[PDB]
Design a binder for this molecule. Structure first.
Ligand SMILES: CCCC[C@H](N)C(O)(O)CNC1CC1
Ligand SMILES: [Co+2]
Ligand SMILES: [Co+2]
Length: 249
């Protein structure tokens, strides 16, 4: 959506804070021995506490408050009896709505220590990709400058991007214009960012695979070569004075 009122801005900040709080709380509780459903239950209780509603459930009838994706799973993992183990690469993606406004945020991290430093590496680079992407965000700038930054960041670190997963406009729903925020540069795109535009920027950085496929169920996205993939997502408002991240505390 395009923000036009201070009341809209406040509503977006409110739901962004809630999603960030939930994301942080879940991440802190992610340790060997907890199940992903147990992690999802935390979101259930906090959403209730803060008067928010799961976007996955509301918008997509997703069977879970949040999406928790582990190891082979890159996105849209279904919270379940799956137990977290030492070294797991975990992505927690929290999206919700309150009073008609939405936020969408996500983080990939490593549980304890893995025997392969690549798991942390994709997390480090996804974080850098996001930072590099938002440095480009201002009214009048090309949307493609986001993907350009993400892919350049990946190349600088001998890594790849997931080409078939993207960001998206957000605010009054989980998906609105721009339809797609790519992780790479499309030279034919003339789409510009404008004042008040609200975007979900979610770079996916991969150890090898350049795309995801259907996973173990109708929701989860995976890679058949079990690449390690990290995502960092925030909800961002494009303003003249710089980007406002509703989902950063
Ligand atoms: C169940 C829907 C979750 C949607 C999710 N919160 C998203 O908007 O970041 C997009 N994810 C797809 C890019 C993998
Ligand atoms: Co998300
Ligand atoms: Co999103």
């Amino acid at each position: 959506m395009i923000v036009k009122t201070e009341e809209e801005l406040q509503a977006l900040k409110e739901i962004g804070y809630i999603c960030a709080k939930v994301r942080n709380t879940m991440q802190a509780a992610t340790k060997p021995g907890i199940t992903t459903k147990e992690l999802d239950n935390i979101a259930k209780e906090l959403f209730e506490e803060y008067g928010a509603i799961s976007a996955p459930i509301h918008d997509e009838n997703f069977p879970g408050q949040t999406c928790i994706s582990v190891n082979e799973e890159v996105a849209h993992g279904i919270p379940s009896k799956r137990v977290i183990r030492e070294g797991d690469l975990v992505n927690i993606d929290v999206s919700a709505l309150k009073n008609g406004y939405y936020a969408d945020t996500g983080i990939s991290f490593v549980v304890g220590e893995s025997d392969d430093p690549m798991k942390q590496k994709v997390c480090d680079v996804a974080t850098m990709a996001f930072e590099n992407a938002i440095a480009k965000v201002k009214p009048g700038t090309k949307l493609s400058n986001i993907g350009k930054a993400v892919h350049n960041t990946a190349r600088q670190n001998d890594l790849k991007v997931i080409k078939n997963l993207t960001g998206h406009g957000v605010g009054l729903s989980l998906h609105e214009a721009p339809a797609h925020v790519l992780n790479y540069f499309d030279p034919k795109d003339k789409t510009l960012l404008t004042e008040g535009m609200v975007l979900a920027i979610e770079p996916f950085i991969s150890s090898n695979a350049s795309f995801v496929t259907e996973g173990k169920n109708e929701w989860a996205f995976e890679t058949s070569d079990k690449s390690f993939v990290a995502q960092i997502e925030h909800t961002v408002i494009v303003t003249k004075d710089g980007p406002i991240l509703t989902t950063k505390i």
